[PDB]
Each structure stands twice: as structure tokens, then as C-alpha cells.
Design an enzyme around this catalytic site. Sequence first.
Site, PDB file in Angstrom:
ATOM      1  N   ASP A  77       0.783  -1.222   0.110  1.00  0.00           N
ATOM      2  CA  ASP A  77      -0.058  -0.033   0.074  1.00  0.00           C
ATOM      3  C   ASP A  77       0.761   1.212  -0.060  1.00  0.00           C
ATOM      4  O   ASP A  77       1.854   1.333   0.300  1.00  0.00           O
ATOM      5  CB  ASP A  77      -0.790   0.099   1.405  1.00  0.00           C
ATOM      6  CG  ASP A  77      -1.878   1.001   1.204  1.00  0.00           C
ATOM      7  OD1 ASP A  77      -2.300   1.183   0.087  1.00  0.00           O
ATOM      8  OD2 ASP A  77      -2.483   1.657   2.181  1.00  0.00           O
TER       9      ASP A  77
ATOM     10  N   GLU B   5       2.677   4.512  -4.534  1.00  0.00           N
ATOM     11  CA  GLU B   5       2.745   5.402  -5.738  1.00  0.00           C
ATOM     12  C   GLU B   5       4.343   5.757  -6.320  1.00  0.00           C
ATOM     13  O   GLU B   5       4.160   5.947  -7.420  1.00  0.00           O
ATOM     14  CB  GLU B   5       1.754   6.612  -5.402  1.00  0.00           C
ATOM     15  CG  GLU B   5       0.282   6.414  -5.347  1.00  0.00           C
ATOM     16  CD  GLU B   5      -0.281   5.533  -4.175  1.00  0.00           C
ATOM     17  OE1 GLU B   5       0.283   5.825  -3.229  1.00  0.00           O
ATOM     18  OE2 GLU B   5      -0.844   4.443  -4.362  1.00  0.00           O
TER      19      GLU B   5
ATOM     20  N   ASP C 126      -9.257   3.809  -2.113  1.00  0.00           N
ATOM     21  CA  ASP C 126     -10.146   4.394  -1.027  1.00  0.00           C
ATOM     22  C   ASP C 126     -11.563   4.863  -1.636  1.00  0.00           C
ATOM     23  O   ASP C 126     -11.548   6.101  -1.844  1.00  0.00           O
ATOM     24  CB  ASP C 126      -9.597   5.261  -0.212  1.00  0.00           C
ATOM     25  CG  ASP C 126      -8.338   5.026   0.418  1.00  0.00           C
ATOM     26  OD1 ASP C 126      -8.133   3.791   0.374  1.00  0.00           O
ATOM     27  OD2 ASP C 126      -7.547   6.048   0.744  1.00  0.00           O
TER      28      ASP C 126
END
Lengths: 173, 691
Positions: B318, B321, B414
Amino acid sequence: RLVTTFPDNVVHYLRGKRVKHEKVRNAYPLYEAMATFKGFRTSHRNEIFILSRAGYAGIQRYAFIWTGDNTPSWDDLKLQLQLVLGLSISGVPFVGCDIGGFQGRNFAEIDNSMDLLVKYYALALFFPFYRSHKATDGIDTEPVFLPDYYKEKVKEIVELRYKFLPYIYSLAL
Amino acid sequence: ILKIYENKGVYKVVIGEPFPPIEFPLEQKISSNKSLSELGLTIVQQGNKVIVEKSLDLKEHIIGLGEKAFELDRKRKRYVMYNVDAGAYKKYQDPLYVSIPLFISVKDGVATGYFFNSASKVIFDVGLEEYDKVIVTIPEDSVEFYVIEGPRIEDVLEKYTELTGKPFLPPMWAFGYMISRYSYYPQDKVVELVDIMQKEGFRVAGVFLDIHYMDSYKLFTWHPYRFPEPKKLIDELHKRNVKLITIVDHGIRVDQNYSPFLSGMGKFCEIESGELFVGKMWPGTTVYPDFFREDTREWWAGLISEWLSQGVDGIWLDMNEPTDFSRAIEIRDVLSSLPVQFRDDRLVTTFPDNVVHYLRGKRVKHEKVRNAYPLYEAMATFKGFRTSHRNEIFILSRAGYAGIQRYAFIWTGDNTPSWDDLKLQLQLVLGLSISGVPFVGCDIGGFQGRNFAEIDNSMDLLVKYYALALFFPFYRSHKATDGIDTEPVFLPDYYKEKVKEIVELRYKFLPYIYSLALEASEKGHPVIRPLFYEFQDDDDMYRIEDEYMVGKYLLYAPIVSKEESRLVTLPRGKWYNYWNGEIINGKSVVKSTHELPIYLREGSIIPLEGDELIVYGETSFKRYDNAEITSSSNEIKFSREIYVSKLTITSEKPVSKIIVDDSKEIQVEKTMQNTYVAKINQKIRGKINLE
């Protein structure tokens, strides 16, 4: 939004007199439409067509008025109806709104569903001004780009409008 | 300089002297005869930028670009490819977490692919700057892109997958029902919840452990109070046949007594001036691994391997990016006092501009290779599974770049629970799927909890989420810390039963889904597909977005509104209504008859749970266990002996009996219109005949 109006120190010459922009602001579009109408006369053009966004009392002498940059949404259907009817009951007969809504995809609260689009075409069925207009980043809303199911519905609505055009035009007279 | 290489309908165009974020092998570098003009491209080199132009016709379709919160046909928008923590994203927000610089053009029914191998901030202006042009701007002086001939969309994806990498084949349990939350703890509660779920009939494949399990958010540690006995926890879950997947961020805490920090020293990201890049993330002050380096990858693989050895079954990557919060926090500290509202610029969460990496020995700016960061992290994590001799690999990643499909599943981050989100999630997963990433899904029920008003936590919407993702490869329920409990066991019987039936239906179709997964890992065909993928020649198909194909045979039109039924658009050909048996002629619109609108295409073979089998028409299908099934005239051939319980044959012409291997005859029963059933319950040497 008031930040987009002319500054307070702007002046004009009305009937030879120097006046502040804030005293005569709303009539600005009226005089522009007047001069534009005069432009058609100068060309000996009998078929006149002028669309204006802003206006003031008397604007009906020279132009059609459309409701500007609306947002596609189910609630907008009711809003557009209040807008055109308010204008209509106020002396401006030739009005309409952007079928399908102007706003494209620059913010989340925009609904580009096809059944809503069909409802727009149906909503303005009898509006004097019947135009489809869309912003740069909005999906293509021309009927030819719709799945057959929806394309046929728009096609039948437009044909029904042309079928009633004679009545609408008589009311225009 | 301009070079063009050809081979297998794939042209590699090289502008200048490119330094790709990753090198993709070409098994035949033959100089091409075709020129740019025959390729229909225009190229310009300017101030450290390369602009590639292509014309765009009115009827031309543009698809791809991966994870985009937009309609599947991408025209009339300027897209930015830059991995970013999107936060509580809404529709039409760009960019998002994943960047796949690939787009496919379908003109006159013929598809052609365009893949720009740059992980920099690439701009795809699709008929926006110039209504009749597709302009691609790469913020680099050199670049390599590929033109991939079709003519079928499937043809483009096979070649693309051949080029960037075939999807890994995950274990069947990776497609099961996963429960997750941010977060579940302490360890006793994790087991209690799993027990209640199983006791009430929910088959749970695995549970995800979010960041609360760590000690002060330190990677590879267990919270001393919430998880004092990790071995106990692990054995209890395995005892219940439940896998354990643990989240792993990319931030290493700058802690003097934290092992990973000390052992990773020398392999972290730096800034232009030479110091380490020190930022902010969950554990506070942090440094980040420079995954572009081989050695950093080896070091990471080691930690992962060691982590997997306790019995952890999967890794959930997670914030990769990669994301950093030092800039945001810096702003919040200086202007905290001021009673003014800040603007939400998501780009503030990306790495600063002065960050550098070492790619293939060369020092490069983060902005030139940013999007490939998650790819290299996934690569190292995958290597970690190999180091552990772990054959069943499971990796989930939030961000990605071309090639990410080699190592991980991708979920849409999300999302916010709402009726509109149902449509958004469908565009997101389908965009990803049509872009080379087959194993995808979204958080069932939506991630966002109750931190803002525009969140809809109604139970019927929750049920619609479960139904929406019925056939998505990745099926997980995940919810934020302050969100209501969304586990099925906490729902009133009315809703609980509906979720239960949906999950059971998913497991019933798992064999088919898994077979498609095998197909994906072997040929690069996506599991779920937009309708235009199978019917690219029909323009109507590019406007249908609330429907999707599962493989080549199943059409699913999920109900994404409060209505009880919906209009279903059927493509050309005949379709069999799974629930009532009706067969409708394609290229029409019909009303749904069940809560889960499923239709089988004429020419389908679908393996179901418990060795069940559905056959409709003639086709050939390879089951996940390698068994090939073929149906023709009135014969169903099997590549090898296999057990068959219940056989369902849909046919417009009556079927009185079937014959197993020329000898035994099994009683056929008409259960409903066009539907014939035969309870075989026995192994079949090689064929079945219909009469």
C-alpha cells in the site's frame, strides 16, 4: 462571481453624458444586441438571428436568450424550466437552454447518463430555442453517437418537434 | 535520430536515445520498412519533450489508459499519467493510483495499440486540444513507444502482454471471499470474527491485517499488546483454512534501533544533493527503499521472505505510488493557525522533485521514472516469494505501471460508498482490465467510513456492492476505521441472507473464473471485459458501461440502482437467460427478470462448483485443471477422463437423452424452457452424445 463584472471606475457616454458603469451596467448587452441587429439591417438581411447570454428590459427587440452554462443533472431539469419560464413571463419570449447541459467533466457533480440526456431533449420539446451545446471536455452528446436504443428516442422527439413547428412558429408571430 | 523496428505486428519506435524505466525484451529486432507516415504518426522534439500526434476520426474509439475515473471511450479529455494518492476520489478526478500509458484505437472496426514506455508525467490529450487529434506529450527528450497491430482488441492485448509480461498465475483461494478492515485487532478478535463468519455459513478465504498490527507502524513487526502471539494467531487461522494477508507499506522508520533501517542503509532513495531523502509516512520520519536498484530489491526480497516464513500467506503493498506526506505536513504546520480552508491538491503527496534513483547504474530524477516505482517494489516482493520457495503467490498493490500484471492484483483504493460509485467502480476495474491488468477488484461496501457527509451506508447499497463484484477477480470487503461494521454477520437476517446467497453463487462460478485466470496467465486475455472487447465492431457497445462480460461466454448486467429491474442491452447473437431459461436474439434491449441479470452466449461451456457443467451451443474451453472440453453437433468431447456431476444443456431443440461414451444412457429432465438436466455423477472417459 461579482469579481467578474467590470471594475467600479469604468465609465460610459450615454446620450452624450458621462456615467458610471454601475449605474447602467445591465443595459450593456441591450445596446450590443441593438448594434448587432443594426448590422443585419445594414446587410439587408431579412432573416435575423441573434443569441445573447445577458440582457435587460427591451432585449426581446433584438435577440433570443439561452440560460448559459447549466450542469447536467436530474435537478437541473426543474431548474431550467424555472429559468426559461421566468424569462418568458418577463417579456423575453424566445428562450431555451443547452440540451444535455453545458458542463463537461471538470467536476464530480455532473451526470452524463444517456437517459437523462433523453429527458433534456424531451423537456425542451416545445421551447422556442432548441440547441444541444456541450463544453470542451464533455462527452460527445450528438445523437449519432448514442446506442440505437437512445438514438431512436432522440430522433422521435426531434421529429415530433418539427411536426409541431407550425404551431410554435405561429405563436412566435 | 529515429529508428523503427518491426516483428509480429509490433513496431518499436525509438526517438533519440531513450533510457526506459524498464527494458522490455524484443525476440527479433528487424529494421522496419514502414515509415512514420505509413504509421499515421507525427513526431516533434522540443524543449526536453517529445510530442506524438495521430489523427482522430469522428467514429474512432479510444480505450485504455488504465485506471481512469471516466467513461471507457476516452475521447474529449486530457489525461495525466502520474501515480498519486487520490484520497477520497470522486468521478472525473485525475490522475489516480495507477499509470498504464497504453491506449487502443478502434477505427473501422480495426484495433491498433499504442504503448509509450515512459514512467514520467505523460499527457494523453485525446481530442481536447485538437478535436481531430490525439496528442501525446512525453516530458523527456527521448522515448520509445510501440505500435501494436490487431486487428482484434484481443490481438493487441496478447502482443502487449507478450511484450510487458504475462500475468502470474495465483492460487485459487486468491479469488475467494476476503474480509478486511482498517483494522481488525487484537489477535483474539480476528479469530472470533472468523469463527462467527464461518459459523453463520460464510466461506472466508482469507483475512487482511491492516497497519494496526504493526508496532508503531514499523514494517515487519508485531504490536506487542495487540499481537503478542503471532504464532498462535497464524495457527488458528490455518486451522480454520483461512489465509492471512498482511499489509506492508514502503516507508522505513528513521529509528536508531530499528533493524530494517540499519540493514537497509546504503539502499535508500536520495535527493539531488546527496543526502538521504527523509520524508513522512505512517511511522513518522521515514526513508524509502530505492527499488530501482538490484541490490535494494535483493535486500527487500530477504525481509519479505523472512516475513513469509512465519506462515503469512500474502502481501498487500500500500501507499506505493510512492506517497509521502512531508510536504502536506509542512503546509499544515506553517498555516495551521490561520482559519482558512486549504485546497486539496493531491500532487502534494507525491515525492518531491529533488529525489533521485539509480536505474541500471544511472542516476535519474524521480519525476522521470516515478510511475515504475510500484512495479519494482512488486518485483522485489514477488522475488521474496520465490526465495521462500512459495508456489502460491498473492500480492495486492495499490499503484502500478505497465508490467505490474507480472506480479500483483490491483484494487481501486479508497472508494466512497454511494449509488454513483457502483458505476464508477465498474469503469475503474474495466479500464484496468482492458489495459493489461486482469486481476482487479474494488472494496465491497466502499472504503470511506463516516468522516464526511456524502457517504451512504445503507444496507441495500451494501448488498448491491456484493452483487456488483460478483464476477470480479478480486472479491474483498474492506472498510475504514470509523466506518460501520460491514461484515455480513452483523446484518439483519433479511440482508445477511442476500449477501450469503451472492457469495455462494460466486463460489459456484469460481471454477469458471479460475479457468479464465489460467487463460489470462497463458495468453494475457482479461478475465472481466467490457462489451466492446467481444463486439468491437458495434459502436453501440462503447457506450454500455453498466454491463460486463466474464470471459467470452457470460454477460452480467448488475443492478446499479434502487430499481427492482433494469434495461439490459444484448450484443449481436443469441443469449440464454440463466435464471428463467429464455433465449433472446441479440442487438436488442430487454428488461431484467432476476436480481442478478446473467446471460449465456450461444457457444458457451461453463464449469461450475462441484464438477457441474453448463453447455450451450458449440465452442471449445480449457478448464483450469488443464481438462479441455469441446462441444459440436451433438457431442461433447473431453481431452481426458473427468468426473461430471450435474450437466445442464440449454437448447432450442428438445433433448431426450444423453449417452456417456457410447454405452450408458442418463435420464434427461426438462427443468424449464430450453433447459435440460442430466444427473451424471460419474467419470467420463472421453465423450457425451445428445439425442
